[model samples]
Target: MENFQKVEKIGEGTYGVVYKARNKLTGEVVALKKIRPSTAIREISLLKELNHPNIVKLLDVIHTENKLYLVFEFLHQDLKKFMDASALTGIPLPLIKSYLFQLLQGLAFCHSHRVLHRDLKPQNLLINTEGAIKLADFGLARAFGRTYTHEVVTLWYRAPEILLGCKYYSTAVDIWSLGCIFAEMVTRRALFPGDSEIDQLFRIFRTLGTPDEVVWPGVTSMPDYKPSFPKWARQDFSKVVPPLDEDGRSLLSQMLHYDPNKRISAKAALAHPFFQDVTKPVPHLRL
Candidate 1:
């Protein structure tokens, strides 16, 4: 505790607070995630088990009587903040592709380890000055195959399956979120900004078309399924994301597939034609 100096309060949440702090001994800056003991335990366990360049690095864990602090390498800001800064001219085309590719790489590592990053909003994606993105915030993350409540991802990025009350969802839920984030990167706006859970479904269906049992088998049996859902035809991907190329459109389509079973896996997304031109960065372990 005495080895660090709290610089500023960076964030606040139900779990606890996050502080930007400096390491007194080495003169290094790090984010101190001060969270409740219960939630901290899970995040620590999961972060300790995971390792990847695109994933946030958990430097150290501090235990103080009743509180817990997770030390993480400091980054400039989140993807949300970065996007807001670039709202005028919008993010560069090559940069958008780079960021999306990095996101897939991180997600691929997580899924292969049998982990589900249930909450994958833009705010959870941290970026450094070098334009490298690291997946952060594991409070809502959980191991795969575990039955979890549908209230996981942020409303705007939530998968239709979970929104429809599918409890046994898989990594496909994260893919849906990545699809939303990808589109946002291109248009500088949320693809589906729904006010409520029901409204969120409407927003998605309005763009992707209302799903039926034939489109997504077993969708009719979902707990939230309703017979009176307004039917809408799917809109063209290029029209929604004008800046995206055809290859990008194809990959995004697979990511946002209504059927969770048919959504592209993170590993498959990394190999998609959309990223064929992006350079493969050698993984680095920044200690």
Candidate 2:
């Protein structure tokens, strides 16, 4: 609190209000996040440990009598805000590819470290003036490789196994979120719009079909698993995401696979043909 000069209040986050502030000595701008005491302690500890280029930097932390403050590299806007402000409804394909690639790079790093970002959506992604996308907000993040008792991720980005009541899940959950983000980037809307958990699963089933022993061998063994829906049937994906190219569509299918084991990993997803057509030798933001 004594180190940086408070500038302006940026916005409210899941935990507290964010402000744009400057270093009193160096005059470098930074985002100051004031966290309430009631906020999750694991989030604070996790952010303290995770560091990656494509992930927002947690610069510093300060504790006060009533609150904890987190300092981060200042970002001008988030992906959702940028999309709302842009003239075009859908992001350009090349830009979409670049953002997804950067996201995968960050996710791959997190997975390697055994971290799971339970909540992933466009709103959690920040965009700088250079068009670099940084994954932010780990309030819902937790260590993976254990039973998935906590049903955390945002409804729209949650994987089917998660929605279907899997107690233990993995990095593949984040991959599903990325798939939803990719489709949203192309359609400028949610790929599956469901008002409730059951409805959400139905929306997913309507497009990709229900999973069974053949597709997802151990899906039925999940703790909360229940098969209440009608007989499985696949529907046309083009009806939901009409604008995606063939490669993009194929990549989306792989990411949204019914089986978490069958779903594409972040590393494998980075090497897909969709990226070959749209990605540059170096990251677009690097230019």
In the order shown, what is each candidate's alpha-carbon RMSD? 4.8, 4.9
In the predicted model 1, the residue pairs found to clash are none
> Distance from true position, residue 196, model 2, in Å?
2.4
Task: Residues 137-243, candidate 1: write the lDDT tens digits.
Answer: 64344421111222333589999999999878898988999899999989999999987899999999999999998889999889999989999999999789997
**Which candidate's TM-score is highest?**
1
Compared with the true structure, model 2 gives a TM-score of 0.85
Q: Give candidate 1 regions above 4 Å deviation.
A: 37-43, 143-153, 280-287
Clashing pairs in 2: 148-167, 148-168
Error of 2 at 264 (Å): 0.5
Full-model lDDT, candidate 1? 0.82
